[PDB]
């Protein structure tokens, strides 16, 4: 209670310096008590930031020598290295923004912040089981936490900034971030005290901004550790990783999925990590996966290979594969009907049609097949239009493919004897390997 006055007295002593003994005693005493937390919260920030400012920006490079008995800088740091969780990082960032000089404590400030990160970087994540707060605060906190790299040399970018950032500028910092989210994930996993998802939610909000600017560092150096820490009977690990990939802020939901499928090992492990519902529970993910199917293509030879592979894998129990087949074929009939997209997307949706055509074995092989066959042949007839044979080429090859997997009896064999030897089926650009792929 009365310590608040000491607090005043602290900032009094702190503002009435040159009294080496008094300041040493008051600072070491305050550190000693750095159960009621309310006044400890006002101390945790509303005394923390003033002492931080006035002891880092106000005092000249002579305080450290006022009492050089190896304790002044010690207590200086031990104020900012541990203690109150959140406001430390905040005031540190705000200062290093404001405190932008050539060098007064600049290098020492960097040493402070680094040595904080290096040991105990969680410091916020584990203490995320909070009730609720203001949203622009979250905004500033997370944006800083995820833009620190670029934020640093803005205030001072030079040879000194270079030697500061010639070992970990990128390629080590996000490596830290990834390591730390690994640690905190596994921590909240093995906790099993009370199901938080709060640290999970916060680190997902992290993953959000990380993905939307950081391009590809965390994918492998997360999933391979996630693969490992999930492969066992990992009830808590699997469930927490599910809830982590799930509640990713729907704002992006796309860079997350793009990276998560791009560098992933294979269809089985991708299907193991996401979750049976993560594609059939968050409709935004429906839209992401099947817009990647329809709209765009990124690498698509191994990439969409794996993506549709996981589509089928997950659909080991999802009767959603037939619906996506029908929609795919309908889009094929429309694109063959309407002034079409350029050839890249054409080959793209072609390969997609093939790979999804892999899975089969069911009733209804009466009418969907009729509409597909008729539309495709009627288009491919005139598709060349004395314009560009490749387009025509495309159709005829899927002709064989559809012939292979529409009703394998009778007339298709005639195709095998007519539209496979004297029907321009000679080029080897990308005809043979996808043809073989057609056999699932």
């Amino acid at each position: 209670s009365e310590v608040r006055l000491a607090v005043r007295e602290a900032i009094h002593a702190l503002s009435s310096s040159e009294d080496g003994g008094h300041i040493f005693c008051t600072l070491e005493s305050l550190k000693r008590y750095l159960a009621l937390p309310r006044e400890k919260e006002e101390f945790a920030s509303a005394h923390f930031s003033p002492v931080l400012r006035c002891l880092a920006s106000r005092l000249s490079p002579a305080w450290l020598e006022l009492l050089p008995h190896g304790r002044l800088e010690e207590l200086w740091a031990s104020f900012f290295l541990e203690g109150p969780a959140d406001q430390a990082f905040l005031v540190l960032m705000e200062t290093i923004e404001g405190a932008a000089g050539p060098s007064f404590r600049l290098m020492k400030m960097a040493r402070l912040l680094a040595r904080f990160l290096r040991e105990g970087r969680l410091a916020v994540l584990m203490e995320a089981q909070c009730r609720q707060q203001t949203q622009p605060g979250f905004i500033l906190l997370r944006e800083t936490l995820l833009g620190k790299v670029v934020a640093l040399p803005d205030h001072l970018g030079n040879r000194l900034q270079q030697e500061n950032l010639a070992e970990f500028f990128p390629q080590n910092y996000f490596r830290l971030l990834g390591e730390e989210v690994v640690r905190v994930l596994q921590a909240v996993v093995d906790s099993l005290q009370g199901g938080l998802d709060s640290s999970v939610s916060f680190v997902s909000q992290v993953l959000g901004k990380a993905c939307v600017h950081g391009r590809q560092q965390e994918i492998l150096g997360v999933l391979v550790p996630r693969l490992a820490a999930l492969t066992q009977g990992s009830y808590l690990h699997q469930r927490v990783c599910w809830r982590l990939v799930e509640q990713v802020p729907d704002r992006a939901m796309e860079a997350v999925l793009t990276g998560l499928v791009e560098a992933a090992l294979g269809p089985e492990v991708l299907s193991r990590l996401l979750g049976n519902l993560v594609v059939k529970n968050k409709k935004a993910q429906f839209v992401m996966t099947q817009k990647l199917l329809f709209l765009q293509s990124r690498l698509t030879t191994p990439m969409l290979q794996s993506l549709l592979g996981h589509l089928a894998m997950d659909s080991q129990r999802r009767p959603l594969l037939l619906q996506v087949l029908k929609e795919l074929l309908e889009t094929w009939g429309s694109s063959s009907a309407i002034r079409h997209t350029p050839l890249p997307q054409q080959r793209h949706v072609s390969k997609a049609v093939l790979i999804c055509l892999a899975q089969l074995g069911e009733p209804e092989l009466r009418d969907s097949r009729d509409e597909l066959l008729a539309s495709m042949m009627a288009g491919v007839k005139c598709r060349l239009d004395s314009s560009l044979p490749p387009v025509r080429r495309l159709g005829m090859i899927v002709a064989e493919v559809v012939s292979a997997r529409i009703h394998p009896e009778g007339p298709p064999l005639k195709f095998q004897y007519e539209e496979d030897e004297l029907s321009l089926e000679l080029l080897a650009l990308a005809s043979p390997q996808p043809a073989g792929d057609g056999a699932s």
Binding site: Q133, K291, I338, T341
Partner: protein
């Protein structure tokens, strides 16, 4: 013998109708004669036309013979034939309807008939009769088995919603297009309509780049054509070329004002066009996710394409609400998906909107359209806006600020909207509803989120507030707010906020109140402390207001308060500083002899100011406000004089100074009206009773 030939033809048709062979096909030859004859009521007899293979061969002959038929229709389009229009139209209708069943290779005849129909499309509403005819013509044609020319025909069958009287016929026809005349499950008409709509949505970059009211024709064609595809647009949306072209088009049309419950901007100078456009974007309620996503993209893309996309998104969600009706065998969206979409769009809007004068009013347009968007979101999503109250409360409430008319008007409208949609009853009352959220939010903002101008939110929540029954909770935070720019007290955006909150608390405690005592005590304390600043008359204003409110039971606080205050004032006061004199007049509320001696020193100092109107009237009203027992100041005023005249402290001060008989001031110098000087009269009259 013109009457003879007339009666002969008439009685011949009559004998036919009284009576009704391969060679009867030569009958059509006379129909050729009947096709270009004197034409009193000629074509009537033709009506004798109508396992029907005999009818089929007759129809072969009639397909060969419809040449003169179409020729006569074009003649009606050129020559008068002002009534035979319906005749020939029904003739062609019956003929072309008589044959599409089976075993009808007829591809040559098909192409010939398509040519003929394209020619006949040259008829459009000569009068009520021509429109009425073409209506049933399209009705019967499009309902036929299968062809490929109707791509043109059906087009005009949708744009026929522009007539003067027969509009009900076209509407009821489009109604009829439900299960028989379908977009439905006949891919041919669908793909032909898609091919049309593609060139359509590739033209509007140019079509609206010309004079007015001709664009309305094209946009109306567009809106109707979409109305055709009520459901089943995902069958044409899914193609990426479609979405790309349509989006890129619409981005340029919308980019000259707007109103509340959408209007476009430069180069769209008519308003009904804008209502039709917002009705056509609202037309999209087939699928949501694709649309909202592809348009959030266009928002994130650049700066010059933002406001357009914002207005788009507003129109799209409002359409997703649901107010007319289309083909009513389809399905509608879901409330939870609505929740997802609204959460996303609102989060992006809020986080993106918190801040070259051209660019300044550009940002003004940005924040305005985003506020209006929030309003529409409340309007459509009226009920389920309860899970996300605070997410909409905080942003615009903090935004309810500098721009009173535009920004704060749209704000107020949005808040009363969320009230009337969620039952919150006079948005001021919403502060009396859930408030601890606001309390803790403002607190933690000012406590950690320091470096950001969260200045006026406290003003909105305490000066424009409701009854102060919640200040007893706010007090400590108020106290904290007091200490806010009083612990470090080195920040411009914090000292300005301190002065602001000072004015606000002063006004509130003035009105709301009439605890508060010590509140005002520390208030005046900090205010007077900071008063030593530069260009801070707000300190004087707050001082005056508080002091006015602080004089009910101010036993000793006010005493030493005013002591130190007037001390610093005399230290400083040496042009609107007379407001402090008004504060002194406010001090005149309960001033005493201490204030008397203070005013005496004040008059002694002001004597240094010469005897030299605006300032004369200011000092006059200052003296006349209280005139606290002027004795030496009596002579000072004594050594035009409206105030000093109106003093009237006695009948001896100015009266002696009223012996001038001068030119100008003498007119008012002798203006004594009443004497009332009978004191000694009654004093002695006390000796006439007892």
């Amino acid at each position: 013998x013109x009457x003879x030939x007339x009666x002969x033809x008439x009685x011949x048709x009559x004998x036919x109708x009284x009576x009704x062979x391969x060679x009867x096909x030569x009958x059509x030859x006379x129909x050729x004669x009947x096709x270009x004859x004197x034409x009193x009521x000629x074509x009537x007899x033709x009506x004798x036309x109508x396992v029907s293979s005999l009818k089929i061969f007759y129809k072969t002959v009639s397909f060969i013979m419809a040449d003169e038929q179409l020729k006569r229709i074009s003649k009606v389009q050129a020559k008068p034939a002002v009534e035979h229009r319906v005749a020939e139209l029904m003739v062609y209708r019956e003929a072309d309807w008589v044959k599409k069943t089976g075993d009808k290779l007829t591809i040559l005849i098909k192409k010939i008939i398509e040519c003929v129909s394209v020619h006949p499309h040259w008829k459009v509403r000569l009068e009520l009769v021509e429109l009425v005819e073409d209506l049933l013509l399209k009705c019967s044609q499009s309902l036929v088995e299968c062809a490929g020319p109707l791509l043109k025909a059906l087009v005009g069958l949708v744009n026929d919603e522009s007539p003067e009287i027969q509009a009900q016929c076209n509407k009821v026809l489009r109604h009829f297009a439900d299960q028989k005349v379908v977009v439905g499950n006949k891919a041919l008409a669908d793909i032909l309509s898609e091919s049309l709509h593609s060139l359509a949505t590739s033209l509007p970059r140019l079509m609206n780049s010309q004079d007015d009211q001709g664009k309305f024709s094209t946009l109306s064609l567009l809106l109707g054509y979409l109305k055709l595809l009520g459901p089943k647009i995902n069958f044409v949306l899914n193609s990426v070329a479609h979405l790309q072209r349509l989006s890129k088009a619409l981005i340029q049309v919308l980019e000259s004002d707007d109103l509340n419950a959408y209007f476009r901007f430069f180069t769209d100078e008519r308003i009904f066009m804008l209502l039709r456009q917002v009705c056509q974007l609202l037309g999209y309620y087939g699928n949501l996710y694709l649309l909202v996503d592809h348009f959030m993209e266009l928002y994130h893309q650049s700066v010059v394409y933002r406001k357009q996309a914002a207005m788009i998104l507003n129109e799209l969600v409002t359409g997703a609400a649901g107010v007319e009706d289309l083909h009513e065998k389809h399905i509608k969206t879901n409330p939870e998906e609505l929740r997802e979409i609204v959460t996303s769009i609102l989060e992006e809007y809020t986080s993106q909107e918190n801040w070259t004068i051209c660019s300044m009013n550009s940002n003004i347009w940005q924040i305005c359209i985003q506020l209006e968007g929030i309003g529409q979101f409340a309007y459509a999503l009226g009920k389920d806006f309860c899970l996300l109250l605070m997410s909409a409360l905080y942003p615009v409430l903090e935004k309810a600020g500098d721009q009173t008319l535009l920004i704060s008007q749209v704000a107020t409208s949005t808040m009363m909207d969320v009230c009337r949609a969620c039952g919150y009853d006079s948005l001021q009352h919403l502060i009396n509803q859930n408030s601890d959220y606001l309390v803790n939010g403002i607190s933690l903002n000012l406590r950690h989120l320091a470096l950001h101008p969260h200045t006026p939110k406290v003003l909105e929540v305490m000066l424009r507030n409701s009854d102060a029954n919640l200040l007893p909770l706010v007090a400590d935070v108020v106290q904290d707010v007091l200490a806010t720019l009083d612990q470090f007290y080195d920040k411009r955006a914090a000292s300005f906020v301190s002065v602001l909150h000072a004015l606000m608390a002063a006004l509130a405690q003035w009105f709301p109140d009439t605890x508060x005592x010590x509140x005002x005590x520390x208030x005046x304390x900090x205010x007077x402390x900071x008063x030593x600043x530069x260009x801070x008359x707000x300190x004087x204003x707050x001082x005056x207001x508080x002091x006015x409110x602080x004089x009910x039971x101010x036993x000793x606080x006010x005493x030493x308060x005013x002591x130190x205050x007037x001390x610093x004032x005399x230290x400083x006061x040496x042009x609107x500083x007379x407001x402090x004199x008004x504060x002194x007049x406010x001090x005149x509320x309960x001033x005493x002899x201490x204030x008397x001696x203070x005013x005496x020193x004040x008059x002694x100092x002001x004597x240094x100011x010469x005897x030299x109107x605006x300032x004369x009237x200011x000092x006059x009203x200052x003296x006349x406000x209280x005139x606290x027992x002027x004795x030496x100041x009596x002579x000072x005023x004594x050594x035009x004089x409206x105030x000093x005249x109106x003093x009237x402290x006695x009948x001896x001060x100015x009266x002696x100074x009223x012996x001038x008989x001068x030119x100008x001031x003498x007119x008012x110098x002798x203006x004594x009206x009443x004497x009332x000087x009978x004191x000694x009269x009654x004093x002695x009259x006390x000796x006439x009773x007892x």
